[PDB]
Amino acid sequence: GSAVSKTVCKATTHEIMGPKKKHLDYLIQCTNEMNVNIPQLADSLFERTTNSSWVVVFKSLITTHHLMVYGNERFIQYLASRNTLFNLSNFLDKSGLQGYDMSTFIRRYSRYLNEKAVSYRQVAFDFTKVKRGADGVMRTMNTEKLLKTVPIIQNQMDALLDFNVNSNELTNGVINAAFMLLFKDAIRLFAAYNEGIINLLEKYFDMKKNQCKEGLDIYKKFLTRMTRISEFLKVAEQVGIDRGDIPDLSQAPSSLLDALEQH
């Protein structure tokens, strides 16, 4: 409460760096205790995003992201259960040039975090954390659910990609911390999108006519998102990310000629 509320403030000071690890680890522990009240924790983070300063606001967003990623699942479950989330579509800190320039990234990042909660609300699991491989959800899921799901991933991906940053704009510790978390989500989200497309192809020839028509549209939009993701990973390469952490995109786009299996 007070100890939680104080940690929230310390994670979101005016200092120009991302939230400190020591504050973030204490918050993560908070989400794992059955006696902590999650809504009060969340409320304190939403209140910090009514501040007028870009630094405070951007740090409150990054804290929320890190908790969705490393915190107990009850945190994102609460965020998904609310009706309204971040309303920063018109944010503008005009106090200095860094302010103006960062305001745009705040808008875009907050939209991605909203879309991340909405996706959890719709399918009741986190695309970034579920079992991959061949024994996983995205690999072993029925054809009806599949057709319903893949388009939700696509949507979460588009909001992520709209962050639209260039290497020459990653110039301070705050936006750099945001980018590192976005990178982590992008690679896990791609893995899951890819798995769904693999299942699709597996089942495509064996399926109803109008189904086939829906699948065709999904494979279609996947190929177009494949090139956007390439551009995103190139910004990561330019910035200096370890090349061992960057996934190899040499997987699944040869086959567009089932655009005729609808004879």
Ligand X SMILES: O=P(O)(O)O[C@@H]1[C@@H](O)[C@H](O)[C@H](O)[C@H](O)[C@H]1OP(=O)(O)O
State the binding partner of 10 from its own copies, ligand X, none, CB within 5 to 8 A by kind: ligand X
Q: For the chain, where are the E strands, in sequence order?
A: none
CB neighbours of residue 65 within 10 Å = 22
Select the residue interacting with its own copies from 3, 6, 14, 25 (CB under 8 A).
25
181 is a contact residue toward its own copies (CB under 8 A): yes
How far does CA 214 lie from the centroid of its chain?
25
Measured CA to CA in angstroms, residue 28 lies from 24, 31, 32, 36, 227 at distances of 6, 5, 7, 11, 35
Select the residue interacting with its own copies from 34, 134, 135, 244 (CB under 8 A).
244
Backbone interruptions in the chain following residues (C to N > 2.5 Å): none
- Tell me the Ramachandran region of residue 13: left when phi exceeds 0, alpha when psi lies from -120 to 50, beta otherwise: beta
Give the binding range for its own copies (CB under 8 A) out of 30-38, 108-116, 135-143, 176-184: 176-184
Euclidean distance between CA atoms 252 and 22, whole angstroms: 42
State the binding partner of 70 from ligand X, its own copies, none, CB within 5 to 8 A by kind: its own copies
Shortest reach from residue 223's CB to ligand X, in Å: 18
CB neighbours of residue 168 within 10 Å = 9
Select the residue interacting with its own copies from 2, 90, 248, 260 (CB under 8 A).
248
Residues lying near ligand X in the complex (CB under 6 A): 10, 20, 22
Euclidean distance between CA atoms 112 and 226, whole angstroms: 19
Shortest reach from residue 233's CB to ligand X, in Å: 11
**Number of amino acids touching its own copies (CB under 8 A):** 31
Nearer to its own copies, 83 or 240 (CB): 240
State the binding partner of 242 from ligand X, its own copies, none, CB within 5 to 8 A by kind: its own copies
Nearer to ligand X, 10 or 132 (CB): 10
Give me the 67-86 binding string for its own copies, x by CB under 8 A, dash otherwise: --xx----------------
Euclidean distance between CA atoms 46 and 120, whole angstroms: 19
Nearer to its own copies, 30 or 178 (CB): 178
Q: Which of 118, 152, 229 is nearest to 183 (CA)?
A: 229
130 is a contact residue toward its own copies (CB under 8 A): no
Please say whether the beta carbons of 67 and 31 come within 8 A: yes
Q: For binding to its own copies (CB under 8 A), which residues are involved?
A: 17-21, 24-25, 66, 69-70, 167, 173-181, 184, 237-244, 246, 248
